Amino acid sequence: MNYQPTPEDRFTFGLWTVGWQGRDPFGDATRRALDPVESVRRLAELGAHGVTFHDDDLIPFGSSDSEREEHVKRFRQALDDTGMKVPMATTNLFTHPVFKDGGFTANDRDVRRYALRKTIRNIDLAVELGAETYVAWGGREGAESGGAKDVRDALDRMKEAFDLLGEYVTSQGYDIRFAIEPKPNEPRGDILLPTVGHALAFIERLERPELYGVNPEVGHEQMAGLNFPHGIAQALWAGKLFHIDLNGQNGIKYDQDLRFGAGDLRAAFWLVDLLESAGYSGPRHFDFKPPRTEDFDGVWASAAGCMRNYLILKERAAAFRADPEVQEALRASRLDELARPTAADGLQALLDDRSAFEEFDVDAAAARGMAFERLDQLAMDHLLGARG
Amino acid sequence: MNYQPTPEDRFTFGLWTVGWQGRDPFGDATRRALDPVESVRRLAELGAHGVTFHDDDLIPFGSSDSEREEHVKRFRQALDDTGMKVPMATTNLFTHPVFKDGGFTANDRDVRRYALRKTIRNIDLAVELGAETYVAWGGREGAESGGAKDVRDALDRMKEAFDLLGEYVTSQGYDIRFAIEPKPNEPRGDILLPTVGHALAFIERLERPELYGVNPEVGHEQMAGLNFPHGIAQALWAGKLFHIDLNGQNGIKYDQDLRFGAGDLRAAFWLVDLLESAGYSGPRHFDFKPPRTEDFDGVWASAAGCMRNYLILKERAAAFRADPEVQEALRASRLDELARPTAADGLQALLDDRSAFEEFDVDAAAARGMAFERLDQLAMDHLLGARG
Amino acid sequence: MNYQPTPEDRFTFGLWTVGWQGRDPFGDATRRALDPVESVRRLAELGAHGVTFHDDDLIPFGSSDSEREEHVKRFRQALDDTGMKVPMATTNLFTHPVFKDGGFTANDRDVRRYALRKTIRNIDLAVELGAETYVAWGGREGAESGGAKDVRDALDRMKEAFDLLGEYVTSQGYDIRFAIEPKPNEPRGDILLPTVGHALAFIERLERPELYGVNPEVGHEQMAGLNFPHGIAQALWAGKLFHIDLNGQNGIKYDQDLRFGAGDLRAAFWLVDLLESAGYSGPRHFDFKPPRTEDFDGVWASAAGCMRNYLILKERAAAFRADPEVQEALRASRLDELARPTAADGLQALLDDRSAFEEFDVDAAAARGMAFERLDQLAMDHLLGARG
Amino acid sequence: MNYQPTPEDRFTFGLWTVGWQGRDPFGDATRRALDPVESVRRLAELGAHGVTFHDDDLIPFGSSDSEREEHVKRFRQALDDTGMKVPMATTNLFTHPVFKDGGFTANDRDVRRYALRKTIRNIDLAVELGAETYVAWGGREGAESGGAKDVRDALDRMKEAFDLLGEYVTSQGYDIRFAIEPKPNEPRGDILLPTVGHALAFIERLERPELYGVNPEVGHEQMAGLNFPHGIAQALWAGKLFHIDLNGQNGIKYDQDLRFGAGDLRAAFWLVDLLESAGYSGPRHFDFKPPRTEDFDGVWASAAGCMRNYLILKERAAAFRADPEVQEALRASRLDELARPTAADGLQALLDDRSAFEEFDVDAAAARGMAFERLDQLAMDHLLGARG
Ligand SMILES: OC[C@H]1O[C@H](O)[C@H](O)[C@@H](O)[C@@H]1O
Ligand SMILES: OC[C@H]1O[C@H](O)[C@H](O)[C@@H](O)[C@@H]1O
Ligand SMILES: OC[C@H]1O[C@H](O)[C@H](O)[C@@H](O)[C@@H]1O
Ligand SMILES: OC[C@H]1O[C@H](O)[C@H](O)[C@@H](O)[C@@H]1O
């Protein structure tokens, strides 16, 4: 009867989430900047396992090698003071005006080289803090008009970028993998690799595909109206779910970054059911924004709420799968047959099987109800804790 | 000053397009059935290069081996009479009630085996009529609720299906490739492999990936709000654009299948520009529905309109790329630099290049306008034939 | 601890809902036709209060005045046998090919007159069966292309139609009101009066506005990505919520008509909270389609599920509003101030109030958090029955 | 053969459009602030008729009554120097943190009174500069969660606000009308009065409805996937199109504010056709953002492009309507009958007309094609200047 999170739950938060000041395209900041050290302390008190950062969240853009050292030093002391970990790091290649047409796929070649140097310096920092995953979110790679970007050349430049980071990582002997985070649009009119599917396909063309996976975000796939649990299943099937970003989104519209559980509640349920059943072992990272209506007390309530909602859905999904009535319904709907090979007897025996065509009764087969609505109502009852 | 199509233009139409009777989820048919032989004759008069078919369009479901032979015979005589070709064929695994939970990923194993036998019989037919591409549209593979379909098991069953068709094709020595046609939803709540990206990623897990590519459709990627020209560029980059379905769509809503050029006009322009510039050599296939408001005269006007609109956009895109003013703008916007390698000097020389980081002037770089709006207005002027 | 519905709950179902045979734009029917008499009996056993009908659901199109009488007679006997009521009736002006360009706004004038006669005959039938609300869903009023429909002339023809039905109803002394049911698209490319807002605005231009209100449907407003509870609040504010259609929808896509509670679960919660708190007294009508994957047992399970899910949300919303902790949070978020007039002192005293501008501390006001995230987490806890 | 705009064309621009510095939710400004005086001069050179402003664009927030006077003085001198007019003004009730929960419908009553005082002061300024229309865009009126805002109370507070501004305007004898500008979302999760329809309906509940109309924006209705030309037709039918905001939008996504003609090109065509044919006489106002990829030269090219694209579409729509072939097609599609009353003979004669029901041939009527696809292809040919 308790939903208190603990560091064993692997809940993580970006510094930029609870640290968002509330600036949006139509208004000024409503909250003051948070000292990252303060953010690490508050989160550890909430039961969080660790934090993530962009380079620029930690070390303000343009810091001397000196102030850099200082910033890192204060941070690492806070991590030591609280026991918090840093499992993922990432680069800011979107805020500075120099990236207005992108970083790795900017039309200006000198900007692309600078984007690579800026990334490499942060990968070094990441490994030193102990991160296992390095995330790439190409928020500015894309276009508002069709002639501004040849997409085949852009994809060449993107592959070229990732191949070089792969060479760098292997040449240095680092233990760190990359994760591509897709987004369909915003802040560009259209962004390159806009969904989980496109990023997965792209990875298979890199020189060392085994170094790269995806970091899918709940709200981003939903901005394309796609089913996030299905996308995640596809990522898992491919062996490529290296990391994941949890939050909430109300439909196809601007990227809302609501706290996890807000937005589409049933998708959050089916997502939790899948992560826990596939035995996902990575961080449960929250990429969310406390609404700018909130003061700092609402910030910490919003962060706590992400963890609570995960722990409640986890208990509801486990009870659903544990319910014998549910196991019976799953058999009535033939989930068991879905898992059996269609033709383990082989092509030849299938061709010779008259019960598979010549003598197949299509009419009987047709008449068989799938019993999916009772199964779904069972899932609803479990979700709402209304199971008798 | 003429936009008359000719068979050298490679324009093709499915039998199901001009043959649509007008039945929709809320109304009865408004037009009588068209004899496929009549459809082949009318289309050849319009300047079409050939037709495509589902098995069930040609041979009514449940035909005896005898009436089958008859139907094929009348068809092939019409092809001989007109000189029309059949470059693509496909299977109907969605209309019959037996496929209500799918064909290759139906939960019932006996339905999946039947779906494979039904497909294989049509591949044989396809090769005999001379088709080079066999399209798979899994319209019923998917779900309306989350518990009804384990997506990792479904993807196993899908891969299993495609692997067996690949074994069959290679064992028979057939010259024919497969093309997966993605759709995000409808008629299922969510459909598996919902975008070009997901189908591409899936193909890399098949046993003989080189046998499979995509058949993207304009309206389907738009039902996910995605940029179709970008998706097509990604398909081309991968060497996987085996075929393409042209039509029009007004946004995220039911699959409209409007005639090509209707819908998003500028996307149609940038698509034509890309197909012609990449030297796409496949059929320009129209998958469209003449609106049920139309009688047969409007049917043939709608079909002609698809071809006309392609030929007009083709001329406008060629004039755009041929315009010296446009070539100058492309250089001002640095499309030329996009095409140059970021670091052909290699990782080490990039790390040692102080002009790439230490001494990079970010501020100057930032100040450089991309000149994309003038380039786009030039593209608009060319599209509207308002270029001075 | 029980969610059994009873006729006092006012749950109603259209004959076309549980009676849907499963025909969709890509497949044949998966279920046989249901005898309306059988549908009335099964629903009464489930605890339903009554049924609704289109004319054509009850009396097959083209029935002789004789077979008509017969059909009505069998129906009314079933109503008498079960105690079921018929609170709403409506017209089918969309299935027959003659309505392919619409009924009231068809370009052909003779089709518009026929649509009015067909409606008037059914209003007579409706009143005789005791219906209080007559619904109009103009599914075919609209267009796929811009030149096909002058929308100002179409709106003249629509107003003209509704004015004549208003004249007819008042001249006959009937006790029956009209309800306009908006839909943004499908089966037309764009449909006229596409949202609750447009229908409300239109009503204010009719000759007797007091005779007309709206019949909003959950899924239809969601096909425009709008917030249905807000739309319903606007309808209530205007005194125009005459009836309502409950179901579920997963986003902007084809009209899914899922059972109520499926789709966007939190919106269903906030909708129930609003209906019960505003004291909506009309039927709780379900306009849903049992998925064609289902046999008749799944049909009846789907129908039961709509009622169950309403009764569970009703209990969760009542517990939320009854929670003292929630009443305290509502005061912390100043819902109490929202309800107070801004300036009951009047314009002049507001102009003279220096505390309202000259001496207003904007900075203090700004700093005040709204406490909305804790309030929302409280609402989530109550919804999931995880409230301590 | 010329598309040069002139002040007689009535093209206007907000100061905030060409003045946008490029700050977006993910990046810093890419352009320096423009002096409004400079913006007025550049626009007059481009052929613009005048400018619009928010209070805060002209007079920086917190200016002394003194610096205020100064700012106004420099502006009005620029207007005198160039002959530019100021036909519309509006209030900024969204940027300052104090408006984070709204202005007129903020839960805090003291914030609502301050919002009214801030507005009234600017209406005075507006009238003095000669504006005829005062626009209200309630960008912050709305919510991210359902319990944070009782929408019936919010609508009471909104009506209360508009009623008081109406009292103020009539008490002062000012010649100025109000225009409500709808937006469905962003920056709030859901915004109140989200479409043209909802704002129109709301206006009919104000105390002096004749003082208020709508200021619809191309991109905002498109963010709900609605047809903007239809929405505008409805506004015109109601006598409520007081002003209009022109720009471009690519679908359902963040508010892009692309230059007019970009986005959905065919909708822009049908919009121009309607404005010119209904004889809309108001400003053609552009609410657009030059993309942050642009330097100031691209800013002025983007602004010129809005005007050019309007003038090209205006010529294409006029040629379409002037084409005798088009006038013939319109008769073949029975646009002429659409404009004729359905029943000017009255209810009684319609009831007695057996040719309207008893003896109506539904089958013949059904068989009649609407000829809409040829009409639309004619419209396409005219749009692309490919009309023989
Ligand atoms: O990838 C790193 C992060 O960068 C930005 O914060 C993006 O907004 C966020 O979605 C992404 O997760
Ligand atoms: O893949 C074969 C064809 O099957 C159906 O006709 C689909 O509606 C169409 O989109 C697809 O192209
Ligand atoms: O308005 C009567 C009914 O007609 C049709 O069944 C529509 O699909 C449904 O949404 C509407 O409620
Ligand atoms: O209403 C005044 C203006 O305020 C803001 O600039 C909105 O972004 C714009 O859409 C609106 O037109």
Side-chain angles (χ1 to χ4, degrees), chain B residues 196-209:
Chain B
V196 163
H198 300 76
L200 287 169
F202 172 74
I203 282 155
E204 298 301 332
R205 289 283 159 278
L206 295 183
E207 278 323 291
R208 310 158 146 101

Side-chain angles (χ1 to χ4, degrees), chain A residues 278-320:
Chain A
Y280 173 64
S281 88
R284 276 83 171 146
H285 183 246
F286 296 107
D287 185 8
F288 88 108
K289 279 169 184 194
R292 76 196 275 285
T293 54
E294 298 310 286
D295 62 20
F296 278 121
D297 280 312
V299 162
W300 303 124
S302 207
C306 298
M307 296 190 274
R308 182 172 175 94
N309 286 335
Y310 194 95
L311 294 175
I312 293 168
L313 298 169
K314 174 170 151 167
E315 150 208 275
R316 304 300 170 88
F320 169 79

Side-chain angles (χ1 to χ4, degrees), chain A residues 3 259 261-262 265 291 293-295 302 305 308-309 312 316 369-373 376-377 380-381 383-386, chain C residues 3 259 261-262 265 291 293-295 302 305 308-309 312 316 369-373 376-377 380-381 383-386:
Chain A
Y3 306 114
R259 75 192 196 276
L265 183 47
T293 54
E294 298 310 286
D295 62 20
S302 207
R308 182 172 175 94
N309 286 335
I312 293 168
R316 304 300 170 88
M370 299 315 297
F372 290 149
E373 286 292 282
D376 195 59
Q377 192 50 46
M380 182 82 66
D381 285 358
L383 170 59
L384 304 173
Chain C
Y3 306 114
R259 75 192 196 276
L265 183 47
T293 54
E294 298 310 286
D295 62 20
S302 207
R308 182 172 175 94
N309 286 335
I312 293 168
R316 304 300 170 88
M370 299 315 297
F372 290 149
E373 286 292 282
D376 195 59
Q377 192 50 46
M380 182 82 66
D381 285 358
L383 170 59
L384 304 173

Side-chain angles (χ1 to χ4, degrees), chain C residues 208-282:
Chain C
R208 310 158 146 101
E210 63 271 356
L211 283 181
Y212 311 85
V214 287
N215 179 52
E217 182 196 294
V218 168
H220 294 173
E221 301 301 291
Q222 284 171 1
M223 285 163 72
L226 299 178
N227 182 309
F228 188 70
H230 287 190
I232 290 324
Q234 184 162 173
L236 286 166
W237 184 72
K240 293 280 176 207
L241 190 65
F242 286 5
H243 197 275
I244 192 168
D245 271 8
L246 302 170
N247 64 10
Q249 167 76 21
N250 277 300
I252 305 170
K253 61 167 67 135
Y254 73 102
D255 182 33
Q256 301 193 284
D257 286 348
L258 305 179
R259 75 192 196 276
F260 188 65
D264 179 344
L265 183 47
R266 288 253 272 163
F269 169 83
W270 294 117
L271 169 75
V272 173
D273 167 70
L274 172 67
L275 294 179
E276 299 296 329
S277 60
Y280 173 64
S281 88

Side-chain angles (χ1 to χ4, degrees), chain A residues 4 8 52 58 62 73 87 102 111 114 145 169 205 221 237-238 256 275 277 294-295 321 328 331 333 348 351 358 380:
Chain A
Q4 199 275 317
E8 352 184 48
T52 60
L58 191 62
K73 189 145 258 67
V111 168
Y114 175 78
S145 51
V169 150
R205 289 283 159 278
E221 301 301 291
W237 184 72
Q256 301 193 284
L275 294 179
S277 60
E294 298 310 286
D295 62 20
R321 296 283 166 184
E328 237 207 10
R331 284 184 267 275
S333 297
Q348 194 55 55
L351 290 172
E358 295 80 358
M380 182 82 66

Side-chain angles (χ1 to χ4, degrees), chain B residues 14 80 92 121 136 149 184-185 204 222 261 284 314 350 386:
Chain B
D80 291 342
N92 183 320
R121 190 145 186 254
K149 199 67 54 172
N185 64 255
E204 298 301 332
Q222 284 171 1
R284 276 83 171 146
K314 174 170 151 167
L350 164 79

